[PDB]
């Protein structure tokens, strides 16, 4: 079992600011990690995927690095519909795990 | 357009169980493994469990011993039997397919809008 | 003399190697795996 941390567990940032949202794995997990957007009442989106792939249709404004144990998640400049929970999720073996969740 | 719909969802006693079902169509499900992923009120993702395409190989979370994933490709259904359910199991379950590009070999992300659980 | 600390082995896993399989994790074991 990989255990999946994030740091800082909530940030306050306004529109136009930079965000940036650090996950760590237990164990080391190379570049086989996801990371989701999660608004109230709606099932999970993914935005990344192998560490920092872009998924069709996100913006522009999103990016994300990393590799092993240390990963970095970056809003560029926040907007008013980027207000969510990210999680981070690893699936280089079973069990797959999700982290914590940080609260923007 | 890609859909996956769970049901079965409801209030149980502790010690009790539920059975839940997840239907699926817009997408060739019988070629995919999928996932049970569940979420507490005020919690987290967990994941719960997966199954291969071919119904073969499985995988548990917290669960295993007492939970039991099964599929059936005729019917393009996924079910999960509960047995031996807690108060700590309250949460909404969702069924989802997961993009992964170690184990199910998945290059897209679904979800459905997940079913509550109620322990009690 | 001063010791050889180039070669290294996993003490640490959440369960056993099939037949020549090969893991150079560094998953803290619940611990870094590797001495």
């Known amino acids: 079992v990989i255990w999946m941390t994030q740091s800082p567990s909530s940030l306050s940032a306004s529109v136009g600011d930079r965000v940036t949202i650090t996950c760590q794995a237990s164990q080391d997990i190379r570049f086989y990690l996801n990371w989701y957007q999660q608004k109230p009442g709606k099932a999970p989106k993914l935005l990344i995927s192998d560490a920092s792939n872009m998924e069709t249709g996100v913006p522009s404004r999103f990016s994300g690095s990393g590799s092993g144990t240390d990963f970095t998640f970056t809003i560029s400049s926040l907007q008013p519909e980027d207000i969510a929970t990210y999680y981070c999720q690893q699936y280089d073996n079973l069990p797959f795990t999700f982290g914590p969740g940080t609260k923007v | 357009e890609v859909q996956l719909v769970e049901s079965g969802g409801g209030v149980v006693q502790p010690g009790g169980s539920l059975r839940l079902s997840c239907a699926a169509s817009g997408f060739t499900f019988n070629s995919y493994g999928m996932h049970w992923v569940r979420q507490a009120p005020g919690k987290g993702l967990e994941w719960v469990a997966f199954?291969?395409?071919?119904?073969?190989?499985?995988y548990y979370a917290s669960v295993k011993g007492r939970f039991t994933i099964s599929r059936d490709n005729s019917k393009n259904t996924l079910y999960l039997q509960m047995k031996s359910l807690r108060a700590e199991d309250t949460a909404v379950y969702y069924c989802?397919?997961?993009?992964?590009?170690?184990?199910?070999?998945?290059?897209?992300?679904?979800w459905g809008q997940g079913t509550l659980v109620t322990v009690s | 003399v001063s010791g050889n600390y180039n070669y290294l082995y996993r003490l640490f896993r959440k369960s056993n190697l099939k037949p020549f399989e090969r893991d150079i994790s560094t998953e803290i074991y619940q611990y870094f795996p590797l001495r």
């Open positions: 989802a397919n997961l993009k992964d590009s170690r184990y199910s070999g998945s290059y897209y992300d679904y």
């Open positions: 199954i291969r395409y071919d119904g073969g190989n499985k």
